[PDB]
Amino acid sequence: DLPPIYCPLESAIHPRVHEVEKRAVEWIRRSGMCASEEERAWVIATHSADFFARFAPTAADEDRLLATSLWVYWGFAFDDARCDNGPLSTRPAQFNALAGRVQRALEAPSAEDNGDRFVPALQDIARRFRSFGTPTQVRRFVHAHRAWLSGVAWQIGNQARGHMPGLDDYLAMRLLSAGGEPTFAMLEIATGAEVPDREMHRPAVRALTEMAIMVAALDNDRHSLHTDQNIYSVLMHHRGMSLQEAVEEATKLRDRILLRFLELHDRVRPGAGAELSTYLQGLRHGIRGNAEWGLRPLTWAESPSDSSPSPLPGAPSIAWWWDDALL
Amino acid sequence: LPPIYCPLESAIHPRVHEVEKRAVEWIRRSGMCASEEERAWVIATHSADFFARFAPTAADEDRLLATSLWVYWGFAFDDATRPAQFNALAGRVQRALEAPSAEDNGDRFVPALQDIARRFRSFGTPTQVRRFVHAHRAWLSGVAWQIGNQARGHMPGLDDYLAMRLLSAGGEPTFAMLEIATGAEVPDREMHRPAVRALTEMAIMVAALDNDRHSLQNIYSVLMHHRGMSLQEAVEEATKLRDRILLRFLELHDRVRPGAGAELSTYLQGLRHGIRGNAEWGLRVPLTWAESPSDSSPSPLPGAPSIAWWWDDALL
């Protein structure tokens, strides 16, 4: 019993998606990233190029769309083999060092793989980003990437302990561990449109970005549907709901965040410069694209399941999203 | 044993005593410390003296205060955890730096950091705040990696050690506060130039290695364990590696400084004042300095491929 997804946002897909996907599938075979044929097939079947082509559906340079799509594949592969499943998945001490080595390899081209098959793959993606984006944009990606790995470390930490975070911590963690920071920070790299520091770091824009990430993360928890750390288990544990009531509750929260995204967007967009405007539409396309890609004649909710204009109850760390003085 | 090679400028803010007085006050009122003994230990760091060496001419005494507050905070945070819990703790503390609406939930360090962050947001631009934010996370990542190795009985090789220690010694957030103290906004096109990234890391690495010495998982253990050196052999070896890094910094700085804008220049002067100030603060907490480096090789450290890019001008 899943409600349709409320997502009155623009759905589009890059016209060169099949071409980029073909190049991606090839890179995957050359990359050394995958141990077996079965693993490669799994990685390919993510259709990560279909995915990221929905985030940057008018990217002028197919190579930029390719590079960024590769990291989406990389991310799914690294996630499935190192974060979500293998020995490190409940071994935070070992993961902290992996995260340190992997993150260092991203920042330091001279780093060596130390027998890790994921590292040369990542260093190649990074090499592509450094040839395309400005050092400022690469730093934004780099910082977003460490942010994601910090979320995963937090999550693997939780898993080791069997700790089910509360709502506030879960959203804070999941904001990072679902991969949205580094995903959305590639928008600029894909489109070529650099957002100036003064605009990019405006509290309002920081908030729209976090909100986009949060809706996408929560649509992913949906798509996933426990001991597993997800919105449904969090609400089941912390509020004693049945699965059905948690399903309904999660959809309200998520819809409420999306309405705030839409209201703040409408306030911010008119005065936005062109680079920021493009970034903002990327946030919209990504929210929609993430939902739709998870689904794939589709059906969508015409109305939000909840329309309260105030901060989400029990989630203080996101309440500043509704603070227009601060934004 | 051997005196430190550090031909860098030493200076200290003229209002250092005034700032230290206000800081001692804030530390007392911050709720950060459980006990008087703990407040005294935090105060005994002389972090205001330390950071007043990093930003000796800051125009606004309140910015030097705000930034000095965090140095006190970082020592206190570091002095007060298993890897699994630390990963969550790091996550939570970092979120409170980023989200003013985040609530302390009885964590003694979170309001204090949020007060520091509020002061930063009343002074610095949102951009300067983000820079500090990301440096803060990087430091936390390093502390998590170090905590991880300790928990496992994993003694990192020289490469992992330096990469980690670059993060864990606290130099990233420390140096990321120079702009907020001085008010000199560094434009991103300058701040993120790889050369400036490398100068920052080098300043950081040297300050970190001098901290290893001031402590008499550190460079000497790492070398003793992986190379089978005696302590005395490792000390000489460590001194050589470090001096060699500082030579690289001095060299790269002299290449970068002349073209630098006023804000970036002030920032680089901060790196230099920081390296010296760190060394000098560590000694004092009349001095003899080595006039010459113990090793003058201009080549990358063999056995440390993660920092080799510091010596690659092509990449810079």
Numbering used by the authors:
A (entry chain A): 9 to 233, 241 to 311, 329 to 359
B (entry chain B): 10 to 89, 98 to 233, 244 to 312, 329 to 359
From the paper:
Spiroviolene synthase (SvS) from Streptomyces violens was first described by Rabe et al. and represents a bacterial class I diterpene cyclase that we were not able to produce in sufficient quantities for crystallization due to protein instability. Terpene cyclases such as SvS form a variety of complex multicyclic compounds with potent biological activities via carbocationic, electrophilic cyclization cascades of relatively simple substrates, either by metal-ion assisted release of an allylic pyrophosphate (class I mechanism) or by protonation of an oxirane/ene-functionality (class II mechanism).
SvS-A2 forms a homodimer in solution, which was confirmed by size exclusion chromatography, consistent with the dimer found in the asymmetric unit of the crystal unit cell. Each monomer harbors one active site which points away from the dimer interface, resulting in an overall antiparallel arrangement. One of the two modeled loops comprises a conserved RY-dimer of bacterial terpene cyclases in the C-terminal end of helix K (312PRYLSL318), which adopts a helical structure in the GGPP-docked model. In SdS, a catalytic effector motif consisting of a phosphate sensor, a linker-residue, and an effector residue was described to mediate an induced-fit conformational rearrangement upon substrate binding, positioning the backbone carbonyl of the effector residue in closer proximity to the substrate. Since this motif exhibits a similar orientation in the unliganded crystal structure as in the substrate-docked model (local Cα root-mean-square deviation (rmsd) of 0.22 Å over five residues) as well as substrate-bound SdS (Cα rmsd 0.30 Å over five residues), an equivalent induced fit rearrangement would likely occur to a lesser extent in SvS-A2. While the active site lining is virtually conserved between SvS-A2 and SvS-WT, the majority of ancestral mutations are hydrophilic and dispersed on the surface of SvS-A2. The generated homology models differ in the conformation of the modeled capping loop K. In SvS-WT-Hom1 (as well as in SvS-A2) this sequence adopts a helical fold and points to the surface of the enzyme, appearing to prevent full closure of the active site cleft (top row). Studying enzyme kinetics with individual substrates revealed that SvS-A2 exhibits well-defined cooperativity for spiroviolene production with a Hill-coefficient of 2.1 ± 0.4, whereas it was previously shown that SvS-WT could not be saturated with GGPP.
